[model samples]
Target: EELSGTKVSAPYYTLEYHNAMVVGTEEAGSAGVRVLYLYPTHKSLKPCPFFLEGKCRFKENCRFSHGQVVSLDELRPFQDPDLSSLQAGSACLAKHQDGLWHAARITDVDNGYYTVKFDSLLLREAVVEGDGILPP
Candidate 1:
């Protein structure tokens, strides 16, 4: 999907931490080991070349990825599920390793993307070795 005029693909999971509920969307087709990471909603300005390798901006010489951009107009939410409903709450975040995945919550959707809290250390570890990722 495109945010703020920058094109970004949705990962099966995101780096931000929050309780998430996937509504209307069907379940995964198969059961197997899955890897999830926090993806910046916006690309970076000086994206590092190694971002493609699964690196983030938290490591040394980690100048590869860029920080997520903040934009009020870029906010979006899943239209089907009522944000206050409990049935949708089943999609809450799960811990795959050190971080959570499977679902995400919209803490600050108005900011384009922001959260009250997340496991940033895990995000840094997951993206530090990839190619460049920057906001538009």
Candidate 2:
């Protein structure tokens, strides 16, 4: 599932609050694992345009807010899947100039950019930056 800026009204944990952002979702009913992006409450920050329209090519280094924040003390259910340790034996999916996101794997690392090779019929390789590349 893809990420987006959206809010929901629900009673969660032990409080009735609208303090949730449904970053992304998947599957149908029956307690689906909603990929919720929880962060410390802070409004007024505008959503990143690249994320809402075009994909944000800049990941951690971007100056704009990705519509998600951080707090060290919050009881978060999961940690950020930054995948900071990508190397020769991991799986990744990279978006190309084409209209599809091709499945890929790490070939090597140059600087911080990852050289990923895809197994598509017509595609082969792509130089992926932080945001252009994602976990498979």
Candidate 3:
């Protein structure tokens, strides 16, 4: 059981939902009828759909994965961790040493390697050079 209002890290799919407040132990509700979340609730551990159908009214800011699918040819790439726009849920292209490239979702930032999950197959790989490429 967590505290009444714990600030936990969460992903988004509509409007930059990076933090989740509601928990499993007698969580608080918007009205406090019994249990509720800061924004109703977000318990999914993957990408959101309204973002793909077209887009939510929240500007790609839901408590989902908050990722987008884009063409690789039109991207530029990211720079050093500190000076780059790349983020944990940012979508970009990834390199596969086997002479290929796949769109990936930035998943980790604990280290400078920048772990990415291949959107093609949900595969995880840590890269530094040509891993996370953003747009120009």
lDDT of 2 by residue, 1-136 (tens): 4434444332334653323454554343333223232332223233455864558887666544454332223323333336676787578867677534567888987777888888676887778787667665
Over the stretch 1-136, how does candidate 3's per-residue lDDT look in tens digits?
3443444433334544233443334212222211121222223334345643557665545665433322223223222223276778887655555333466677766555667777665455656453334321
In model 1, what is the error at residue 16, expressed in angstroms?
Answer: 14
When 1 and 2 are scored with TM-score, the better candidate is 2
Q: Order of all candidates by TM-score, from best down to worst? A: 2, 3, 1
Q: Residue-wise lDDT of candidate 1 within 1-136, one digit each (tens)?
A: 1222222222222443311121112123432111112332333323444543455556545533333322223223422313332221122232233322323332332222223222344442221100211111
Cα lDDT, all candidates? 0.28, 0.54, 0.44
- Every model's TM-score: 0.19, 0.42, 0.32
> Over 4 Å off in model 2, which ranges?
1-80
What TM-score would candidate 1 get against the native?
A: 0.19
Model 1: weakest 10-residue lDDT segment is 127-136
Give the better candidate number (1 or 3) by lDDT. 3
Q: Which stretches of candidate 1 lie over 4 Å from their true place?
A: 1-65, 70-83, 87-89, 95-97, 103-136
Name the TM-score of candidate 3.
0.32
